[PDB]
Design a protein around this ligand. Sequence first.
Ligand code: 6QP
Length: 226
Amino acid sequence: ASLTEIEHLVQSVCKSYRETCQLRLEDLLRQRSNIFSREEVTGYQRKSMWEMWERCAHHLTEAIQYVVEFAKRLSGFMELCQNDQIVLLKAGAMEVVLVRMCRAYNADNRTVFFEGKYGGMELFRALGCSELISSIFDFSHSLSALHFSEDEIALYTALVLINAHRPGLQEKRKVEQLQYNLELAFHHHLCKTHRQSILAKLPPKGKLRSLCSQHVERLQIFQHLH
Ligand SMILES: O=C(Nc1ccc2c(c1)N(S(=O)(=O)c1ccc(F)cc1)C[C@H](CO)O2)c1c(F)cccc1Cl
């Protein structure tokens, strides 16, 4: 709405993000050295489809709850009706989860942090979702090339959540106000750090819609006759 409350907004969001991320970037980097041995990997591959789905679904659910907390710490979010909160939370929450998981990825050897160590795609063999796992790893790789700072992720994902072009909203104009403020903050921050160039190199989303839709499709296959 004005200057200096804009910077207050930026630091507000970055603070909320710092307090709602599962692991801190310091520790994810620190443990890049720590890799799953072949015994451990094949250990994960010998799990049944249903054990593996249970584990990953749990991890996913945990991640999503952390994103829900993040949303609650954004100014204006709690003053929305329960409905709009829910809508925004569906779409946004899983998408935000995928960006943060970009944080958890290591492009040097194409491994991701999982249950304490780094490992490649081969773990998730037990899931029986080769194409989806591939898509996830590719997305994280390309985002990893952009070198997001924690602040850039904070603001980007806040913008992913607070989208007033989600179909189903009742108080569309309140969400548009929150969105507008957040876009303003994001762009001012990028200019002050001279990172605005990255606005061209953002992932076209609908690539993100593809990951979500893929999760839905594979869930539909999974629960079909079992
Ligand atoms: O596992 C599935 N989806 C999923 C998406 C995002 C996630 C997670 C899971 N988890 S995770 O388990 O730790 C994880 C999974 C795959 C990775 F490559 C790295 C990490 C948490 C992570 C928090 O940073 O964000 C999945 C999937 F990919 C296919 C079918 C069913 C499921 Cl549940």
